[PDB]
Design a protein around this nucleic acid. Structure first.
Ligand SMILES: [Zn+2]
Length: 56
RNA sequence: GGCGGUACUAGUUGAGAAACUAGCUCUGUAUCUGGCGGACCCGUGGUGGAACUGUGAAGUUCGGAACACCCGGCCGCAACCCUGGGAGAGGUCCCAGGGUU
């Protein structure tokens, strides 16, 4: 056949870290003990307090 | 907890407002990159072979494999982006594909 495909191009370099994330660390608060999916910061309803006004 | 703006409160300085510091109020804030489940398909991917020999390590024989738990991809999902097309009084739209999580 000859002539089908070819290039052979070098391209490397993928060194990146996640704040030295640990298998026992949190990727949210950076706290060690729980996981991000278990971060106590994870907000969620219902809502806390409730506003209310009258004549103003 | 920390800081900034606000006012006030205290202390100091000062004649002076004002300056500074501290206290604090409110106000506001700032982070899920390792993705999570699902099924159970593929790779012996990872790790602990089993007994036996032996003071000890190490081996040996067995099987030459098995199992188990995890593992990756993989699928379902949402997020982000690359890519394109065409018209539109200037970058609007709509929609599909992939990768990664
Ligand atoms: Zn956390």
């Amino acid at each position: 056949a000859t002539v089908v495909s070819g290039q052979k191009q070098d391209r490397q370099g993928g060194e990146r870290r996640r704040s030295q994330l640990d298998r026992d660390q949190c990727a949210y608060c950076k706290e060690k003990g729980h996981w991000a999916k278990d971060c106590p910061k994870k907000p969620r309803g219902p809502r806390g307090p409730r506003p209310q006004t009258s004549l103003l």
